[PDB]
Amino acid sequence: YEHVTVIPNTVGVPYKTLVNRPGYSPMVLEMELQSVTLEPTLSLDYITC
Amino acid sequence: YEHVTVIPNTVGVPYKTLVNRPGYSPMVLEMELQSVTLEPTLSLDYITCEYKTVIPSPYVKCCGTAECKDKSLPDYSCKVFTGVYPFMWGGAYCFCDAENTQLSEAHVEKSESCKTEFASAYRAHTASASAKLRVLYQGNNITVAAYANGDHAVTVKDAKFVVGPMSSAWTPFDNKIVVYKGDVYNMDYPPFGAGRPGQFGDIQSRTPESKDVYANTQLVLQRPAAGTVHVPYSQAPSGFKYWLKERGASLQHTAPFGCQIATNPVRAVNCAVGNIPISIDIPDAAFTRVVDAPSVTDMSCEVPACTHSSDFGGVAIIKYTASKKGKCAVHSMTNAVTIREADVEVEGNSQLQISFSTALASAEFRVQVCSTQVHCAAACHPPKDHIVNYPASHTTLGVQDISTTAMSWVQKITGGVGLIVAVAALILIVVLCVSFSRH
Amino acid sequence: TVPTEGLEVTWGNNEPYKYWPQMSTNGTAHGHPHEIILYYYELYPTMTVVIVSVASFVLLSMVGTAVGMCVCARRRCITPYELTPGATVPFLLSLLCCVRTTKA
Ligand SMILES: *[C@@H]1O[C@H](CO)[C@@H](O)[C@H](O)[C@H]1NC(C)=O
Numbered sequence: 197y198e199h200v201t202v203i204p205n206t207v208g209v210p211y212k213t214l215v216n217r218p219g220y221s222p223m224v225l226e227m228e229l230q231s232v233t234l235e236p237t238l239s240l241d242y243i244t245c
Numbered sequence: 246y247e248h249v250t251v252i253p254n255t256v257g258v259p260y261k262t263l264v265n266r267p268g269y270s271p272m273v274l275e276m277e278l279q280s281v282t283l284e285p286t287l288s289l290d291y292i293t294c295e296y297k298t299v300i301p302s303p304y305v306k307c308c309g310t311a312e313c314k315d316k317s318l319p320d321y322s323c324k325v326f327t328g329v330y331p332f333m334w335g336g337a338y339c340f341c342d343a344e345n346t347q348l349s350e351a352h353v354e355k356s357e358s359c360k361t362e363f364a365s366a367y368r369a370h371t372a373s374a375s376a377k378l379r380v381l382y383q384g385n386n387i388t389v390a391a392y393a394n395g396d397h398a399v400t401v402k403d404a405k406f407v408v409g410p411m412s413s414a415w416t417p418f419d420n421k422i423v424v425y426k427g428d429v430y431n432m433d434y435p436p437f438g439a440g441r442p443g444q445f446g447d448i449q450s451r452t453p454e455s456k457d458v459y460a461n462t463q464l465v466l467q468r469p470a471a472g473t474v475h476v477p478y479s480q481a482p483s484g485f486k487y488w489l490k491e492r493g494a495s496l497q498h499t500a501p502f503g504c505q506i507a508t509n510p511v512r513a514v515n516c517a518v519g520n521i522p523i524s525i526d527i528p529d530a531a532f533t534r535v536v537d538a539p540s541v542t543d544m545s546c547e548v549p550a551c552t553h554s555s556d557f558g559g560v561a562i563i564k565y566t567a568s569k570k571g572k573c574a575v576h577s578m579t580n581a582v583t584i585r586e587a588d589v590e591v592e593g594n595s596q597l598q599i600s601f602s603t604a605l606a607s608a609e610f611r612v613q614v615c616s617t618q619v620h621c622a623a624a625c626h627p628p629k630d631h632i633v634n635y636p637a638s639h640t641t642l643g644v645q646d647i648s649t650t651a652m653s654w655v656q657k658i659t660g661g662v663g664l665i666v667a668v669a670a671l672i673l674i675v676v677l678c679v680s681f682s683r684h
Numbered sequence: 685t686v687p688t689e690g691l692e693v694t695w696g697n698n699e700p701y702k703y704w705p706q707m708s709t710n711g712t713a714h715g716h717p718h719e720i721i722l723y724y725y726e727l728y729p730t731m732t733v734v735i736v737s738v739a740s741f742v743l744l745s746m747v748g749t750a751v752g753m754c755v756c757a758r759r760r761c762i763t764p765y766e767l768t769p770g771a772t773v774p775f776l777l778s779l780l781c782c783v784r785t786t787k788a
Pocket residue numbers: 360361362426
């Protein structure tokens with residue numbers, strides 16, 4: 197149901213995490229991330245030519 | 246055999262029972278009551294309704310002195326007001342001025358609303374009980390009505406049964422009960438003929454179609470002003486026309502134990518408290534022989550996943566080995582767990598599963614299958630939700646109840662020091678052995 | 685607050701609602717990290733916490749009885765050498781070792 201987990205911040209590595217509700221059969225879950233895009237905040241001081 | 250069972254008075258749980266006739270198969274039977282009501286005694290005391298003042302036209306006694314002959318009417322009232330002066334198009338109606346008096350008179354009565362829309366003040370004492378019950382009898386969801394008192398016998402389908410008496414003589418009604426067209430109120434009404442004026446209870450009749458009524462309407466006739474030819478009379482506020490606000494609520498929302506109260510007649514269905522004993526009786530015509538039932542061996546029960554919820558939170562899986570093909574009844578012998586399956590079909594060396602539930606954490610348990618004991622244990626889990634919209638079934642439990650390693654913990658921590666207190670007893674007896682040999 | 689019996693709640697001219705309690709939030713298990721008493725928090729919270737309190741009381745009473753036997757044992761091991769004027773009891777206190785085993 198509700199699950200929290202921690203994956204290490206690496207790119208291009210598959211990871212699996214076990215989810216287990218009681219009662220029913222447990223599942224293992226496959227996830228893998230592809231990008232961590234850092235979008236910093238912008239503000240223009242000036243230009244120069 | 247005759248079998249007497251007892252069921253707690255709750256609606257919505259299939260209770261089970263086992264009729265053990267030795268020399269015959271066990272009889273796991275099902276009962277489930279669908280509705281249980283109370284019929285309190287009918288005795289209407291008095292109808293009450295909305296009054297209407299009946300006011301005749303005034304009698305302007307023009308410079309004579311009038312009086313009124315004291316006619317016997319409910320709240321008849323009269324006054325001869327002296328010094329009156331009416332006005333019309335030619336000013337005064339009559340000519341003289343000094344002895345100009347006015348005979349004024351009025352009384353009260355019922356209305357047409359009394360023909361249709363009223364309240365009934367009502368007396369109701371101890372009641373009877375009637376119910377309807379479904380029995381899962383051998384692939385038949387049968388259902389029988391019976392008024393439950395212990396004194397009504399009904400037999401159907403080779404089954405004779407007497408239901409009742411109830412164990413709790415509690416009733417949601419008091420002595421006084423007032424009914425309005427779709428609701429009841431447990432309120433002490435003032436007695437008929439003793440109506441307090443103004444407040445509810447004044448204008449009263451025994452039958453809805455009397456020609457006499459009792460009233461208390463405090464009617465005062467004040468003085469008319471100059472030219473205002475009318476009837477200056479004190480208003481009589483009756484309890485009905487403002488009765489709508491002080492109702493509080495009907496008994497549908499003030500009842501204990503959740504009774505639903507329906508009028509005409511005033512039944513109180515699902516008054517859920519107490520228990521009822523039932524007597525069921527059945528001869529051989531459904532009984533199955535011991536040797537002609539398929540006996541079983543190789544009892545291998547286990548529980549893959551138990552969860553002590555309110556639904557069927559345990560699916561117990563059991564592999565067996567029978568003797569032949571036929572029906573087989575299954576039964577829980579302790580009250581910690583409950584099962585949802587009456588009987589199953591078994592052919593030989595096969596496997597089945599069942600849907601049980603319990604309330605506590607960890608328990609071992611011995612089921613009976615066709616007079617064959619089988620023990621298996623389980624460790625369970627609680628559900629993640631907190632609220633469901635149906636009562637459970639197993640949750641009647643005790644306080645000295647078996648668990649997981651909790652009892653190993655309580656066997657741990659009571660290790661004892663009384664043995665070394667006995668060692669202190671040994672040192673005192675080995676010092677008292679010098680002179681401890683007379684008393 | 686839904687009681688241990690159960691709640692009925694009606695809203696308007698709708699047909700009412702029927703609610704019931706269940707097992708708890710249940711931050712609990714059974715292990716060497718205990719989490720046992722939280723199971724206690726559905727079978728009667730704040731009722732038979734009197735049971736675990738009086739259970740702590742009866743175990744402190746048991747070790748109080750251990751204090752009782754220890755003071756009776758020290759007094760009755762001083763009893764064989766109350767002040768027996770021989771000044772040397774090796775087969776009493778060497779065999780005994782209650783308190784101050786240097787006193788011969
Ligand atoms: C309708 O009115 C009749 C006569 O006024 C009365 O006998 C009957 O009980 C009423 N029924 C309802 C449902 O109001």
